Amino acid sequence: RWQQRLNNYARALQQLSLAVNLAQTRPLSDLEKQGLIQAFEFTHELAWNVMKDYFFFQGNSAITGSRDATRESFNKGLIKEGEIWMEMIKSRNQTSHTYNQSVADEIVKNIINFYHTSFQAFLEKMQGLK
Amino acid sequence: VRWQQRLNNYARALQQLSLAVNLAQTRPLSDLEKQGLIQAFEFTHELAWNVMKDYFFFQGNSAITGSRDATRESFNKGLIKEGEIWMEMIKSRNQTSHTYNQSVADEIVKNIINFYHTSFQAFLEKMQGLKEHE
Amino acid sequence: VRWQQRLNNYARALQQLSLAVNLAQTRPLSDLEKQGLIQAFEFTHELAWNVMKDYFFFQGNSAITGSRDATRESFNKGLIKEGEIWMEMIKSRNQTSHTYNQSVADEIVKNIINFYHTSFQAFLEKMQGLK
Amino acid sequence: RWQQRLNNYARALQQLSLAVNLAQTRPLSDLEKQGLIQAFEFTHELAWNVMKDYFFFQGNSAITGSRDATRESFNKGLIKEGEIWMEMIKSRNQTSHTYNQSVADEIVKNIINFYHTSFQAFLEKMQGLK
Ligand SMILES: [Mg+2]
Ligand SMILES: [Mg+2]
Numbered sequence: 001r002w003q004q005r006l007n008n009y010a011r012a013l014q015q016l017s018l019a020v021n022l023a024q025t026r027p028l029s030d031l032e033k034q035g036l037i038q039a040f041e042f043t044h045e046l047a048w049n050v051m052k053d054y055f056f057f058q059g060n061s062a063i064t065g066s067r068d069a070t071r072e073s074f075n076k077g078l079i080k081e082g083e084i085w086m087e088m089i090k091s092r093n094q095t096s097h098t099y100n101q102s103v104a105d106e107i108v109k110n111i112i113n114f115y116h117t118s119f120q121a122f123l124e125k126m127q128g129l130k
Numbered sequence: 131v132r133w134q135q136r137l138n139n140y141a142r143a144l145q146q147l148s149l150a151v152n153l154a155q156t157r158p159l160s161d162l163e164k165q166g167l168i169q170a171f172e173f174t175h176e177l178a179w180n181v182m183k184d185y186f187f188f189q190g191n192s193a194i195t196g197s198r199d200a201t202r203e204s205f206n207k208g209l210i211k212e213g214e215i216w217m218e219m220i221k222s223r224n225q226t227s228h229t230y231n232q233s234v235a236d237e238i239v240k241n242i243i244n245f246y247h248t249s250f251q252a253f254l255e256k257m258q259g260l261k262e263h264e
Numbered sequence: 265v266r267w268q269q270r271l272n273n274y275a276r277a278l279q280q281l282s283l284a285v286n287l288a289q290t291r292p293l294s295d296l297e298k299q300g301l302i303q304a305f306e307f308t309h310e311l312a313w314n315v316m317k318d319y320f321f322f323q324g325n326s327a328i329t330g331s332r333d334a335t336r337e338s339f340n341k342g343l344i345k346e347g348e349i350w351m352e353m354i355k356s357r358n359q360t361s362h363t364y365n366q367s368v369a370d371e372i373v374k375n376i377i378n379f380y381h382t383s384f385q386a387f388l389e390k391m392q393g394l395k
Numbered sequence: 396r397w398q399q400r401l402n403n404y405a406r407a408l409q410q411l412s413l414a415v416n417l418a419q420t421r422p423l424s425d426l427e428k429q430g431l432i433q434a435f436e437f438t439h440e441l442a443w444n445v446m447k448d449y450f451f452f453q454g455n456s457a458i459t460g461s462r463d464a465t466r467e468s469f470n471k472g473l474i475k476e477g478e479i480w481m482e483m484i485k486s487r488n489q490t491s492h493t494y495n496q497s498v499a500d501e502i503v504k505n506i507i508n509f510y511h512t513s514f515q516a517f518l519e520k521m522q523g524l525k
Contacts (some may be wrong), residue, residue, distance in 0.1 A: 005231040006228070006253075010195075011230060012230040015161070015230055018162075019162050022162070030146070030165065030166075031149075031150050031153075031163050031166040032162050032163060032166055032169075033159075033166070034165070034166035034167075034170055035161075035162040035163055035164070035165030035166030035168075035169065036162070036165075036398045037166075037169055038165040038166065038168055038169040038172075038229065039162070039165055039230070040228070040237050041226065041227070041246075042226070042228070042229055043230075045227045045249075046227075046230075048453070048459070054329075055329075055330060057330075057332065057353075057356060058329055058330025058331055058333065059313070059330055059332055059354035059357050059358060060330055060331070061148075061357065061360070061361065061486075062360050062487070063458025063460075064275045064443070064459070064460035064461040064462070065458070065460020065462070065463060065464075066353070066460065066464070067460060067463075068460050069460075073191045076330065077329065078329065085279075089296035092457070093457075095169075095172065095173070095457075096172070096173050096176045096177075097141040097168065097173070098173060099139075099142060099146055099170070099173045099177075117279040117423075129329075179454070179474040192472070195450075195453055195472065195473065196450060196452075196453025196454055196455050196471065197453055197454035197455070198452060198453045198454055199453065218451075219454075220454035223454050223456065224451060224454065224456050226456060229458065246505075273494070274460070276494055277494040280425070280494055283426070287426070294427075294428075294429050295410070295413075296413075296414050296430035297424075297426050297427060297430055297436075298430070299410075299429070299430035299431075299433040299434055300425075300426035300427055300428070300429030300430035300431075300432075300433065300512040301426070301429075302430075302433055303430065303432055303433040303436075303490070304426075304429055304492065304494070306433075306490070306491070306492070307490070307491050307492070307493055307494045308489045311491075311494075334445075345429040357462070360436070361436070361437050361440045361441075362431065362437070363437055364403070364406055364410055364434075364437045364438075364441075365505065367400050393493070
């Protein structure tokens with residue numbers, strides 16, 4: 001059920017948002033930065049599964065993974081910022097290298113400056129769809 | 131030597147994980163800090179099993195397709211002692227997407243603190259010794 | 265006009281499905297022919313709901329995201345009468361990866377022959393009349 | 396469980412192989428060609444899910460779709476003909492057009508001439524891994 005996936009996406013995003021707000025109030029420790037990255041990862045995993053579950057509900061069983069799901073979501077208007085959602089997939093592919101502080105800082109910057117807003121917009125869109 | 135350069139990166143990663151583990155031994159971690167400990171586990175484990183894959187490729191074994199194969203061959207050859215613990219690490223890796231549930235995050239953290247950190251350190255010392263002698 | 269080009273291909277697809285459906289009324293299909301009937305249902309259904317999407321888009325509706333949306337709007341606007349049958353089509357589409365199981369292949373084939381074929385034929389007449 | 400997925404892949408492939416041998420015996424009807432295409436669809440869907448399940452079993456939960464499962468299988472030596480498997484994905488993307496006889500014939504040709512032998516090699520490799 002795509003609505004159950006959406007409810008879990010909402011929960012995960014709530015945790016990500018608490019971390020983003022914290023980072024707004026003060027600098028994050030190195031450990032907290034790693035945690036923000038992990039929350040981004042479980043929120044994005046939920047998001048593209050919401051996409052795939054929703055298109056399955058619509059009758060599209062051809063979508064396989066996150067790139068398929070993101071491309072169909074952009075094509076059908078579930079997301080507007082196709083570029084940012086593609087960048088998220090690239091960021092996920094960098095996860096194993098965040099023990100380098102430059103990589104961690106770059107991913108954190110993208111999460112705060114771009115991904116959180118896009119996650120919130122996708123939540124609002126999918127909630128409006130049911 | 132490829133496996134030795136990987137090991138240098140593994141050692142760096144593990145130093146970061148160890149900082150977080152000893153802090154966790156000191157006080158409760160926040161939810162966000164637990165997520166960070168899990169992330170550090172993930173990059174440390176990824177490096178560890180690739181050290182093993184590199185090492186066994188250097189030794190002539192090209193039948194390692196992932197962390198399970200690498201762990202099995204390492205336990206077969208004695209690079210690791212605690213087979214069950216290293217297998218459980220793979221289960222923990224596969225739970226990463228569910229750590230927005232507090233019970234899942236708490237269980238991975240518990241396993242990192244009680245078992246995985248020790249195994250990571252033992253494996254580092256083992257491979258450091260293998261730079262010098264069988 | 266995009267939707268009429270889609271309709272023209274839908275007609276060609278439905279003609280091929282009809283051949284197989286009328287053959288199945290004649291005799292048992294081989295296991296392979298059953299798979300072929302399912303494939304023709306797949307390409308005929310895919311054209312059908314994209315005809316609906318293209319048509320409503322040509323009337324100014326850009327809110328259709330998939331075959332379920334397209335079916336609902338077609339029912340609301342009278343392009344189909346058998347809303348529940350068209351809804352079952354979507355369930356059938358979502359099962360085609362499992363037609364290596366005979367229970368699944370036979371269920372889909374039965375629905376194609378007993379229900380979907382006539383629904384496809386009605387939709388053809390409706391949209392050719394709007395053409 | 397990747398072993399259960401492999402068992403289902405073996406059953407699906409057995410049906411595809413029956414169709415390929417029948418084609419060796421005599422020309423296929425248009426409907427029978429459509430059936431060979433459907434068998435290719437359910438066999439390939441199972442195959443790339445066998446890859447994904449196996450890498451999950453290995454501890455890699457980053458694979459999401461058919462493309463990255465296929466790339467990872469080539470990288471880890473599970474398949475030797477990476478480009479044929481990538482072509483398989485493109486053929487999947489064309490199956491909605493097999494109401495045109497030219498498309499149907501091209502896909503059938505690739506199934507008989509290339510995909511079947513690759514499917515069999517992958518089955519043998521994965522069964523060897525047990
Ligand atoms: Mg992570
Ligand atoms: Mg098909």
